[PDB]
Design a protein around this ligand. Structure first.
Ligand SMILES: CCCCCCCCCCCCCCCCCC(=O)OC[C@H](CO[C@@H]1O[C@H](CO[C@H]2O[C@H](CO)[C@H](O)[C@H](O)[C@H]2O)[C@H](O)[C@H](O)[C@H]1O)OC(=O)CCCCCCCCCCCCCCCCC
Ligand code: CLA
Ligand code: CLA
Ligand code: CLA
Ligand SMILES: C=Cc1c(C)c2cc3nc(c4c5[nH]c(cc6nc(cc1[nH]2)C(C)=C6CC)c(C)c5C(=O)[C@@H]4C(=O)OC)[C@@H](CCC(=O)OC/C=C(\C)CCC[C@H](C)CCC[C@H](C)CCCC(C)C)[C@@H]3C
Ligand SMILES: CCCCCCCCCCCCCCCC(=O)O[C@H](COC(=O)CCCCCCCCCCCC)CO[C@@H]1O[C@@H](CO)[C@H](O)[C@H](O)[C@@H]1O
Ligand SMILES: CCCCCCCCCCCCCCCC(=O)O[C@H](COC(=O)CCCCCCCCCCCC)CO[C@@H]1O[C@@H](CO)[C@H](O)[C@H](O)[C@@H]1O
Ligand SMILES: CC(C)=CCC/C(C)=C/CC/C(C)=C/CC/C(C)=C/CC/C(C)=C/CC/C(C)=C/CC/C(C)=C/CC1=CC(=O)C(C)=C(C)C1=O
Ligand SMILES: CC1=C(/C=C/C(C)=C/C=C/C(C)=C/C=C/C=C(C)/C=C/C=C(C)/C=C/C2=C(C)CCCC2(C)C)C(C)(C)CCC1
Ligand SMILES: CC1=C(/C=C/C(C)=C/C=C/C(C)=C/C=C/C=C(C)/C=C/C=C(C)/C=C/C2=C(C)CCCC2(C)C)C(C)(C)CCC1
Ligand SMILES: CC1=C(/C=C/C(C)=C/C=C/C(C)=C/C=C/C=C(C)/C=C/C=C(C)/C=C/C2=C(C)CCCC2(C)C)C(C)(C)CCC1
Ligand SMILES: CCCCCCCCCCCCO[C@@H]1O[C@H](CO)[C@@H](O[C@H]2O[C@H](CO)[C@@H](O)[C@H](O)[C@H]2O)[C@H](O)[C@H]1O
Ligand code: OEC
Ligand SMILES: [Fe+2]
Lengths: 34, 52, 35, 30, 30, 36, 82, 35, 335, 37, 340, 254, 64, 36
């Protein structure tokens, strides 16, 4: 039913987001330097 | 900027030298024509006087 | 000390020459069978 | 006396290099 | 710590003698 | 230099002894074909 | 060689799969988000909230200094924290 | 074929999958904890 | 005859010369012999060398108070910097020695030969009709020897910096580098470690597994090694029994079964990884140092909470401070 | 007493000789400095 | 009688093999990797040491860790239900219970995983040179995370399960034990470092010595996973190296054993070394050098140089790194060069 | 060719040349044992047990002879520093002597057993092949072991028949060799209570005697004899090496 | 072979070579003593580690 | 006693070295009949 190349990219871009939300957290977060 | 620049380009610069070898080495053997493996039937080595 | 500089250059040039020519001497040719 | 002891073991590695190369048992095709 | 290796070696050499000299030539279902 | 006085021996034996052990074996091997 | 049981390639592609998981996955994600969000996590793992390391002054660290009476010590440490 | 729905492997694949997402959600939540 | 040159070019290129002197080798051979010979003498006898800029000469040779572990060939002086200091540029050998002349002679030569050594590692393959790329795997170490001996100094401004030829001074290069670049905290080194650590890990695996699936062809009282004969026809172990086990250790698809695909992963993992560290030293050569998390995790009032990153930095300062005790006149270490 | 059955010959090839000397001599270049101390 | 009925069940060729060994390998392994992942994001190292060690606190992937227990704890096992924790899980988290928990579970986890290599090997019928090879890592972890500390004052001095929390363990060693000058660590390196070289020179030799058994360029397919002739030419290889380095293999069986011995041996020597540093039986100094430098103030070797670095690493680090010691070093005591 | 690292394989089925081998190892360890003793006696300074006690002088074997009762020399001095006492024969010199003699006998015995290696008692009566009944073998040894273990705790440590053991006070100021009384209470499990060292060798000695007879009498379940490849002497080696390293890790810790 | 006085008085000991009880013989009794031994060491290990304090025990140099 | 410091080596080598020379020959002799 649901194609691989479509399960992938969705999830892929998906993790790029959560891992990006993490990278934003570096600044502003508690681990920020402010 | 002087850091960022000089830094990035050494990486690029380098990898490209690696790249150079990679292709110069491949195209220089794709020509003699054996970039896909030694010819079982006629192994150049097998016809050379041993050194011991 | 100057003589040593001369010598070395002469010496380094001799080898740099050999190298450049040796490859110019049609190196592609040297191999099992140049397809 | 140490200098000498160090330079010896070294001179030995170097002579052992010669022998291991130019005096091995040739790897004959079987 | 050096005798632990002895244990793990001889032990394994006991429960494995049947193969100590190499796997049984010709096999399948692996 | 104030070196350890037993160093010259600790190093000498540590080389000869096992090193000779090997020489013995090797040669005694060769002679199993009359060699040496 | 021997290839047994329900395959992944298929299962990932199965509509039933996403039917089932497009509930479960975010469920867990929001379930844990609240674990932190609620501040529950803090209390579960005695981890200090940004405003609970030193009481206004005490530039001194609350360091456990002895086993056996270790706990009572930690307690009073949180105490002082007013 | 008639593959089963709940296998030993499923028990495994979930013990790491369930906690993770729970965490990824918790961790993604911290990114907003400040001061 | 047929003009000796024509002939010369055939010997130089002999495919059956005990050691393959090649066109690259025509340089590698004298260059490495100049370096190797000067190193060996320098290391045995050789006056203390005013490494840093001051006049606090360090002795590295054996005849001057060292042992194999402490001894080394010391880097050319800081007063010299990046300037080219060959023997003919000295007023006398003594000057040349006191200022560290031996180092430059030794590294410029080792780097030249080690390069041709890389080129040679291609020429022979060609002459033997084999695939190239071996020389590309060797570009990792070379790249690391280049970083540490040439790139790092070009960045810092002097060969006085840049790993010294000696066991203990190598530790020096490191302990200081850390304090100056916080390298352990740089992505490129961590990849270097994953490479070097990983590489070993797999070297044990490959070597392990294969040995574990050799085909019984020897008694119990005779080496397993004899079961193989040089150049023998077919394989010498069951690459399927191998995968049969390893696959089951973790899980089938989390394993290999293609010698070619397996052996490539062996030469790519450590090479790619080691390249990076070379790119780390080469990068931190221009002062783009490791990560810096000092005074992050600050609390509600503003108190700094200290993370392991700080105990690190605390130990780094200690290095920063004591190193080169007599070479600083001003607050910031910008060299 | 008479001949003993269990009894093989011992062996060590050139390569091993060479690899041994390398191991010995090198272990010696390593530890010698800590022996003289 | 049912033992077998069970044995049968356990030894069934599933996706992820199990085995009797698994009845240990998984209960622990998971339970350990689990505790790490937990402590790494949730629990703190504030009462134990004096730092933020998790995500919830503000730490990032590099700066997080499950840091050892307080020094005042000792070599206590820290059993959740023991004298210290007194059953209270949360406090258990605060006193550093999560460390002995990870350490000990991971420990039995490596025991489990080796038994596995030994269980699967016996079944599939292959030699066990992979459970033997794996002794090398047992040595490292069993001596660096268990023996070492047992030799010192408490667990507080063991590595801490963290990226930086390790780099710290590295410098500490350089600074107090002067590790890099230890012959055993040296071998350690010579092995890990050269094991990498083997694992890369062999990989490249194989790939650039392949016979042609395909038509295209991507020669990965040309290898029949099925038996027969060698895929590359050992004869050609042996030739290459021998003329380009003088020495060269010529016995695949020996080559692959060497590849097992090199990296394994070196991590073993690496271990013995640390077993020594547990008793502070380090290789710190060369007396011959000290006596000379004491008398003659113009004698300087890269040796002495490095020894001053250590003095610095200890002086400036010690204070925040060993809180239970209440160190107080007035600015006038701190050893320092000039200017800096 | 047999590899060098296997040369000693020629004994995996020569109970005579094995016992001969094992006899030579023991003989050497005794040699060394008394050997060490003498070296130390030839360099130990007894003049001051206050500020220059044996442990300052890098003494390794001397302390072990002290713990069990040997505390004096034929030279008239005591390790506690007592005015002209008189060990029996059992002085540090005597102990060293005894050992030097033992390693002598063991050496000779090690030869007899090498020449006369083909002893009937070594071959399976049913077959013409050599063989050792390890299970009964073990039971016999464990019997003796325990028998001896008991004896050591009962008569030696107790002073019932022999000296005692080195017992001191909380601050090593008054140590000496006194006879210790067993202690079965729970405190006898406190590593610092000598009475525990006595009660142990008395209990574990009996528990060791009982267990011996058992193995001397009861045969190994079919299943187990197969499992732990019994009958293969090399399975005993792995089992001992495992305990020997266990014992080790425990003596290193204490 | 070569029998001898000592050799004979011993023969009956090194005589039951392959001799073996049937099936799972005493194995379960063995599994009980083992698990029993195991827990005891844990009791020791935990006394020495003071992770199990007892009245009158106390693990310090203190005693005599 | 103020003995010569190289005595311990001068005596050690003076024994091992030639003594080993003989051990080598003897053993290599035995093996010309597979012995050892
Ligand atoms: C390869 C092997 C395969 C790998 C797999 C192995 C898995 C096993 C995991 C189990 C680890 C358990 C170790 C626990 C331990 O050691 O437990 C640790 C305890 C340590 O006891 C110590 O005891 C004290 C020492 O002070 C002593 O000195 C005096 C002055 O201070 C005081 O009077 C004090 O009372 C007295 O005890 C301190 O408190 C120390 O900090 C410490 O707690 O070991 C002890 O007692 C018991 C000693 C047992 C010996 C084994 C340790 C080996 C080294
Ligand atoms: C309890 C004692 C013990 C005993 C009786 C044995 C017995 C045996 N071992 Mg095992 N072994 C042990 C402990 C023991 N081992 C330990 C602790 C380890 C881990 C290091 C090993 C590792 C080991 C390996 C890796 C191998 C054996 C092999 C063998 C068999 C042949 C040995 C041989 O050829 O030696 C002859 C040895 C030499 C010519 C060289 C000796 C070199 C060392 C480094 C010198 C040290 C010398 C010094 C005097 C020793 C003092 C000892 C110290 C503990 C006090 C033999 C059955 C071999 C085998 O299985 O064969 C098929 C084999 O390959 N063993
Ligand atoms: C004839 C009997 C005999 C006697 C009375 C002695 C007596 C002595 N020996 Mg000597 N020894 C002997 C034979 C003997 N030895 C032999 C045959 C050898 C080998 C050649 C040695 C080798 C030797 C050495 C190398 C050393 C001594 C030392 C000593 C002195 C005390 C050291 C000590 O505390 O050991 C205590 C010993 C033990 C801890 C043994 C018990 C071992 C474990 C705990 C038990 C294993 C049991 C097993 C698992 C079975 C299960 C038991 C069951 C009940 C449950 C002591 C004077 C020491 C000394 O000071 O030298 C002068 C020393 O360093 N001896
Ligand atoms: C259980 C082992 C043991 C122990 C703990 C001791 C302990 C002690 N000895 Mg005794 N000794 C022993 C065995 C032991 N000895 C033996 C078997 C002998 C006979 C040779 C001696 C002979 C002896 C003498 C002659 C003297 C002592 C002295 C001493 C004391 C001083 C410490 C010292 O000498 O450090 C020195 C230790 C070292 C630096 C050794 C380190 C070992 C290196 C690392 C091994 C080599 C590495 C290896 C080759 C690596 C290869 C790896 C491979 C995988 C490739 C100390 C109490 C001295 C004394 O009387 O004190 C006042 C003294 O003069 N001992
Ligand atoms: C650099 C670090 C390093 C790592 C991370 C590592 C990892 C691994 N090696 C394995 C194997 C091997 N490694 C081998 C040789 C080597 N391995 C080396 C170095 C490493 N090896 C070296 C130097 C060698 C010598 C060449 C061999 C020969 C094998 C194998 O056969 C085996 C394999 O299958 O190969 C792929 C795998 C075993 C899985 C397992 O035990 O599960 C069971 C245990 C679990 C799940 C619990 C973890 C236990 C530890 C004690 C707890 C750590 C705590 C946290 C979980 C993590 C710490 C966090 C960090 C930030 C510090 C595992 C992936
Ligand atoms: C094919 C491509 C190959 C690429 C290879 C690269 C490998 C290198 C690893 C990098 C890891 C990413 C880290 C990003 C940093 C970050 O910021 O993520 C952290 C969580 O990280 C993490 O949780 C990463 C930890 C990984 C766990 C390992 C998985 C184990 C398997 C379990 C079974 C399933 C959290 O961030 C924090 O978020 C906040 C916490 O209060 C603050 O802002 C902090 O300062 C900080 O920013
Ligand atoms: C002063 C500083 C000291 C530095 C020390 C450096 C040590 C590095 C040397 C590498 C170790 C060898 C590892 C492979 C083992 C092997 O396999 O080589 C063996 C020869 O070994 C040896 O005795 C090798 C002796 C070392 C030679 C040094 C090379 C010098 C370079 C010259 C440059 C030319 C321009 C013999 O080969 C084997 O021989 C047989 C073994 O039974 C089988 O055929 C095997 O498959 C294999 O062919
Ligand atoms: C053990 C311990 C402490 C460490 C020892 C480390 C050690 C000996 C270093 C390795 C030496 C080294 C540089 C390896 C080179 C080996 C070599 C010549 C390999 C070339 C080579 C590679 C290959 O894959 C094939 C098929 C053939 C025929 C080859 O000749
Ligand atoms: C993991 C993985 C994966 C994944 C992937 C992914 C996830 C991807 C993604 C991707 C993406 C996600 C992409 C995107 C792209 C895009 C593009 C390419 C774009 C372009 C654009 C443009 C050009 C624009 C323009 C403009 C605008 C918009 C605005 C206005 C202005 C202008 C006009 C400028 C795969 C499957 C491979 C497989 C393996 C694994
Ligand atoms: C402790 C404990 C316990 C338990 C617990 C557990 C078991 C847990 C688990 C947990 C888990 C199991 C978790 C997990 C988590 C995870 C995470 C959080 C992850 C993340 C990841 C990431 C973030 C990634 C990324 C990446 C990379 C690395 C690379 C490539 C690319 C990417 C980007 C994708 C109990 C109760 C018994 C008791 C007490 C203690
Ligand atoms: C280097 C070293 C080592 C080693 C060493 C050893 C192992 C030694 C041994 C030694 C020994 C092992 C010795 C022995 C000795 C012996 C002796 C000295 C004996 C004697 C004997 C005698 C004198 C006898 C006599 C007699 C006879 C025959 C008959 C009867 C009568 C009489 C008793 C008179 C160690 C590892 C620690 C560490 C590192 C270094
Ligand atoms: C392929 C091999 C390459 C080898 C290259 C080197 C070849 C020359 C080898 C020379 C060997 C002897 O080298 C010589 O040893 C003696 C010790 O024995 C050293 O002498 C050393 O000890 C003596 C005391 O015994 C001290 O007074 C002296 O001050 C100290 O330097 C010499 O300073 C060193 O020059
Ligand atoms: Mn050698 Ca780089 Mn710290 Mn400025 Mn000097
Ligand atoms: Fe391979």
């Amino acid at each position: 039913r649901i194609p691989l190349w479509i399960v992938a990219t969705v999830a892929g871009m998906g993790v790029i987001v959560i891992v990006g939300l993490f990278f934003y957290g570096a600044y502003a977060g508690l681990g920020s330097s402010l | 900027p002087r850091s960022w620049l000089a830094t990035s380009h050494f990486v690029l610069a380098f990898f490209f030298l690696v790249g150079h070898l990679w292709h110069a080495g491949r195209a220089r053997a794709a020509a003699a024509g054996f970039e896909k493996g030694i010819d079982r039937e006629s192994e150049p080595v097998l016809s050379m006087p041993s050194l011991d | 000390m100057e003589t040593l500089k001369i010598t070395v250059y002469i010496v380094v040039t001799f080898f740099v020459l050999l190298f450049v020519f040796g490859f110019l001497s049609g190196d592609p040719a040297r191999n099992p069978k140049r397809k | 006396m140490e200098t000498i002891t160090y330079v010896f073991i070294f001179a030995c590695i170097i002579a052992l290099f010669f022998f291991a190369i130019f005096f091995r048992e040739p790897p004959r095709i079987t | 710590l050096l005798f632990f290796f002895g244990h793990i070696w001889h032990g394994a050499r006991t429960l494995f003698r049947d193969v100590f000299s190499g796997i049984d030539p010709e096999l399948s279902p692996e | 230099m104030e070196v350890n006085q037993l160093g010259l021996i600790a190093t000498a034996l540590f080389v000869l002894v096992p090193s000779v052990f090997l020489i013995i074996l090797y040669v005694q091997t060769e002679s199993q074909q009359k060699s040496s | 060689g021997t290839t047994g049981e329900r395959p992944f390639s298929d299962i990932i592609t199965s509509v039933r799969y996403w039917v089932i998981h497009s509930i479960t996955i975010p469920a867990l994600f929001i379930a844990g988000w609240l674990f932190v969000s609620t501040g529950l996590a803090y209390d579960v793992f005695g981890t200090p909230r940004p405003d609970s390391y030193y009481a206004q002054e005490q530039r001194s660290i609350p360091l456990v200094t002895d086993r056996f009476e270790a706990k009572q010590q930690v307690e009073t440490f949180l105490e002082q924290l007013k | 074929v008639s593959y089963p729905i709940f296998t030993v492997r499923w028990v495994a694949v979930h013990t790491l999958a369930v906690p993770t997402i729970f965490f990824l959600g918790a961790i993604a939540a911290m990114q907003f904890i400040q001061r | 005859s047929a003009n000796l040159w024509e002939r010369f070019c055939n010997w130089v290129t002999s495919t059956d010369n005990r050691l393959y002197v090649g066109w690259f080798g025509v340089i590698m051979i004298p260059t490495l012999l100049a370096a190797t010979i000067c190193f060996v003498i320098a290391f045995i006898a050789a006056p203390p060398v005013d490494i840093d800029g001051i006049r606090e000469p360090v002795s590295g040779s054996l005849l001057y108070g060292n042992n194999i572990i402490t001894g080394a060939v010391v880097p050319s002086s800081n007063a010299i910097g990046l300037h080219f200091y060959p023997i003919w540029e000295a007023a006398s050998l003594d000057e040349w020695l006191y200022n560290g002349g031996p180092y430059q002679l030794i590294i410029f030569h080792f780097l030249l030969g080690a390069s041709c050594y890389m080129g040679r590692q291609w020429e022979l393959s060609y002459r033997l009709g084999m695939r190239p790329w071996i020389c590309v795997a060797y570009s990792a170490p070379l790249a690391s020897a280049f970083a540490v001996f040439l790139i790092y100094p070009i960045g810092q401004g002097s060969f006085s910096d840049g790993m010294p030829l000696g066991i203990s001074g190598t530790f020096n290069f490191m302990i200081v580098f850390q304090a100056e670049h916080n390298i352990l905290m740089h992505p490129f080194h961590q990849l270097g470690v994953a490479g070097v650590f990983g590489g070993a890990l797999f070297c044990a695996m490959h070597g392990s597994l294969v040995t574990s699936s050799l085909i019984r062809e020897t008694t119990e009282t005779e080496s397993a090694n004899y079961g193989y004969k040089f150049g023998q026809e077919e394989e010498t172990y069951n690459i399927v029994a191998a995968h049969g086990y390893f696959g089951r250790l973790i899980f089938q698809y989390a394993s290999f079964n293609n010698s070619r695909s397996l052996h490539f992963f062996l030469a790519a993992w450590p090479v790619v990884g080691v390249w990076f560290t070379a790119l780390g030293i080469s990068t931190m050569a221009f002062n783009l140092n490791g990560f810096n998390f000092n005074h992050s995790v600050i609390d509600a009032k503003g108190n700094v909470i200290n993370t392991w990153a700080d105990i690190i930095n605390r130990a780094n300062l200690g290095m920063e401070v004591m190193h080169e005790r007599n070479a600083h006149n001003f607050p910031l270490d910008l060299a | 007493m008479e001949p003993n059955p269990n009894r093989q010959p011992v062996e060590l090839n050139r390569t091993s000789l060479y690899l041994g000397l390398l191991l010995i001599l090198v272990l010696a270049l390593l530890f010698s400095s800590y022996f003289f101390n | 009688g049912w033992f077998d009925i069970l044995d049968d069940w356990l030894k069934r060729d599933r996706f992820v093999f199990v085995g009797w060994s698994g009845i240990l390998l998984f209960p622990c392994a998971y339970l350990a990797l689990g505790g790490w992942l937990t402590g790494t994001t949730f629990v703190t190292s504030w009462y134990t040491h004096g730092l933020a060690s998790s995500y919830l606190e503000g730490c990032n992937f590099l700066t997080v860790a499950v840091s050892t227990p307080a020094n005042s704890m000792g070599h206590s096992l820290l059993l959740l239900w023991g004298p210290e924790a007194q059953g209270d899980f949360t406090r258990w988290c605060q006193l550093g219970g999560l460390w002995t928990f990870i350490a000990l579970h991971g420990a039995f986890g490596l025991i489990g995983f080796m038994l596995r290599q030994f269980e699967i090997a016996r079944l599939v019928g292959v030699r066990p040179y992979n459970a033997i090879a794996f002794s090398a890592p047992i040595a490292v972890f069993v001596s660096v995370f268990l023996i070492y500390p047992l030799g010192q004052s408490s667990w507080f001095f063991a590595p801490s399960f963290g990226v930086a929390a390790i780099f710290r363990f590295l410098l500490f060693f350089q600074g107090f034990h002067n590790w890099t000058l230890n012959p055993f660590h040296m071998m350690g390196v010579a092995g890990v470092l050269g094991g990498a070289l083997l694992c890369a020179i062999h990989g490249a030799t194989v790939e650039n010595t392949l016979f042609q058994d395909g038509e295209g360029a991507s020669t990965f397919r040309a290898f029949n996973p099925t038996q027969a002739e060698e895929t590359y030419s050992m004869v050609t290889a042996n030739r290459f190296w021998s003329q380009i380095f003088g020495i060269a293999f010529s016995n695949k069986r020996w080559l692959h054993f060497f590849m097992l011995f090199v990296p394994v041996t070196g991590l073993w020597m690496s271990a013995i070394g640390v077993v020594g540093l547990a008793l502070n039986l380090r290789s710190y100094d060369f007396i011959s050098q000290e006596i000379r430098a004491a008398e003659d103030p113009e004698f300087e070797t890269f040796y002495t140089k490095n020894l001053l670095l250590n003095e610095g690493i200890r002086a400036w680090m010690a204070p925040q790194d060993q809180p239970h010691e209440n160190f107080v070093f007035p600015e006038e005591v701190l050893p320092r060069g000039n200017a800096l | 060719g047999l590899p060098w690292y296997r040369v000693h394989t020629v004994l995996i089925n020569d109970p005579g040349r094995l016992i001969a081998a094992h006899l030579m190892h023991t003989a050497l360890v005794a040699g060394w044992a008394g050997s060490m003793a003498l070296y130390e006696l030839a360099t130990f300074d007894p003049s001051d047990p206050v500020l220059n006690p044996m442990w300052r002088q890098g003494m390794f074997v001397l302390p072990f002879m002290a713990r069990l009762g040997v505390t004096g020399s034929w030279s008239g001095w005591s390790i506690t520093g007592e005015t002209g006492i008189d060990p029996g024969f059992w002085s540090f010199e005597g102990v060293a002597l005894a050992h030097i003699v033992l390693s002598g006998l063991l050496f000779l015995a090690a030869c007899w057993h090498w020449v006369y290696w083909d002893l009937e008692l070594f071959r399976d009566p049913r077959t013409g092949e050599p063989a050792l009944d390890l299970p009964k073998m073990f039971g016999i040894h464990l019997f003796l072991a325990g028998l001896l273990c008991f004896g050591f705790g009962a008569f030696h440590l107790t002073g019932l028949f022999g000296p005692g053991m080195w017992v001191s006070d909380p601050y090593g100021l008054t140590g000496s060799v006194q006879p210790v009384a067993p202690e079965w209470g729970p405190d006898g499990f406190n590593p610092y209570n000598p009475g525990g060292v006595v009660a142990h060798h008395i209990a574990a000695g009996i528990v060791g005697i009982i267990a011996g007879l058992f193995h001397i009498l009861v045969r190994p379940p079919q299943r187990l004899y197969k499992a732990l490849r019994m009958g293969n002497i090399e399975t005993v080696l792995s089992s001992s090496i495992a305990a020997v390293f266990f014992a080790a890790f425990v003596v290193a810790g204490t | 072979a070569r029998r001898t006085w000592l050799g004979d008085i011993l023969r009956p000991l090194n005589s039951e070579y392959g001799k073996v009880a049937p099936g799972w013989g005493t194995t379960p009794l063995m599994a009980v003593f083992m698990g029993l031994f195991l827990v005891f060491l844990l009791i020791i290990l935990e006394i020495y580690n003071s992770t199990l304090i007892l009245d009158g025990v106390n693990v310090s140099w203190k005693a005599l």
